[PDB]
Structures are given as structure tokens and as C-alpha cells.
Homo-oligomer: A and B are copies of this chain.
């Protein structure tokens, strides 16, 4: 709702206010924006740091885990105020589940996924899809990382009749593999990988808000130079036995909603009521 800029705010944001695309007009977008981050460790931290810094209006965070007593949500928020006092930080000081995940998302304009568990990753997309929200998902384990921008702009469930942004299921159809799953606790993590990926995640979120890419298009089709409906899956491999290689960042363009997707496709048996009840039980492992 805020229409004008504080001398306080004008001073803080002037460095990125004077860039093509980001006027008093472009900045107010971010200040009224409401972004949510699911997961506070690893990808959460840098993602949150670069939203905070950018002056995203409200920044949510969801993690019931503690540090290695004190929840990691709290630790991080305490950190973020130092970067930017002005944003409203909103800690969900527990872990997301089917019972709540519906409740935890309906408020927020853009969803970031840093969840680190495959079951949860599927859950979010489902909900995000149903509620009609854009997902910037991102993953990192060991020496490798990857990122993608799903359901932007958010196309209603089952509307296959129009060129329409792919869901996480549409992409990554049925896998997760049961015994091929490594965790960040299991397999470790190099710092710059999770860092690159988080920072980029924030990058995509900011973009979505500032250029208003979650806004459905004018019977007109959506420009393909946005890479929204046909979005790249950027894969970062970190080779600590080599310098930056031509095959360091590979960009795999992806298909629009799979007409037969379980969730966002034609004849989906997926209901918000469903997930709550335990309907698509996330027993895929």
C-alpha cells in the first residue's frame, strides 16, 4: 500500500534504485512484497540475506531445527536485522507438515524452497500449485547444486488449454529415488555451492516481484524471453580440482505443464482438503 519513500529508505536503497528497471516504482514493489523461505539452514541463510538486503517488505522463514537449544529460525532473524532493520521478519518456529503447510503459505506472494527433504519438496509444489503461488525451488548436496522457477506466472490447476508454467511434479515427475537420496547432513556440503544457489534463489524471487512476473498475461500469450513458461533448470557443479569451466553452468530448458501431471494437469485427483487428510501420503521415499 505504501506510495512514498522515507529519507531513511531513500538513503539505504539509492545504490540499486539508480539501475534500469528499479525506480521509486520498482523499489516499492519489493517493500510491499511478502516472500516466504521454507528451510533456515544452508540455502535459507544466503537466500534470506539477499532478500533482506534488497528490502523485501515481509520475509518469512520456516525451520523447527536448532543450531550446531536455540532454533535456527531465531538465530538467522537475529542475523538479518543487522543487514536491514526495516523489513518485517516472520519466524515459523516449527517444521512444516501437510496439516499446516496449507495455512503457512496462503498469506505469501512468492514461495522459496530450501527444505532439503524430498517428500516436503513435493508437498510444497502441490500446495503452492493449488493456492496459486509461484515457487523458486533450489537444491544443493556435496560438490553440486541446481535451481528452477516453477508455476510462474501461477496458472490455475487443470488449465492445460493455455501455454502454462510447469509444476515441480510436471518437472521431476515421479522420482524421488528411495535409496539414492543423500541429505546435506549425510554427504556434506562445500560453502560456495549452497551460497551461489541461495543468492540466485533470492535473485529469481526479487526479479519476479520487481518486474511483476507472477502477474498473468493480458487472450495474449506470455513472452518466451522471460523463460517463465519454458524455464531453464540451471545446474551448478563445483569441481575443486579445476577453475571455472565452460561446463560449470549448464542451462537445461524445461517443458510447460505436462497435460497429464498428477497435480497441476487435466483430471487431477488432488485437493487442498486431500493433503490435509494425508491424501497423497508422502510415503514415496
Interface, chain A (partner B; CB < 8 A): 11, 14-22, 46, 50, 53-54, 68, 79, 82, 142-143, 147-149, 152, 184-185, 187-192, 195-196, 199-200, 202-204, 206-207, 210-211, 213, 225-228, 231-232, 234, 238-246, 248-249, 251, 253
Contact = CB atoms under 8 A, between A and B. Distances in A.
A139 to B, nearest CB: 14
14 contacts: A18-B188, A19-B187, A20-B143, A21-B241, A195-B199, A196-B196, A207-B239, A210-B240, A225-B242, A226-B241, A232-B245, A245-B251, A248-B249, A248-B251
Contacts of A244: 147-149, 200, 204, 227, 231-232, 234, 251
A108 to B, nearest CB: 19
B243 A191 contact: no
A258 B50 CA distance: 39
A54 B245 contact: no
B243 A228 contact: yes
Contacts of A234: 244, 248-249
Given A207-B242, A248-B249, A142 B190 contact: no
A234 B249 CA distance: 9
A206 B228 contact: no
Nearest to A184: B15
A143 B20 CA distance: 8
Nearest to A141: B19
Contacts of A210: 240
Contacts of A226: 241-243
Contacts of A207: 239-243
A171 B108 CA distance: 47
B225 A191 contact: no
Contacts of A191: 16, 50, 53-54, 202, 206
Nearest to A239: B207
Nearest to A193: B203
Contacts of A18: 187-188
Nearest to A241: B211
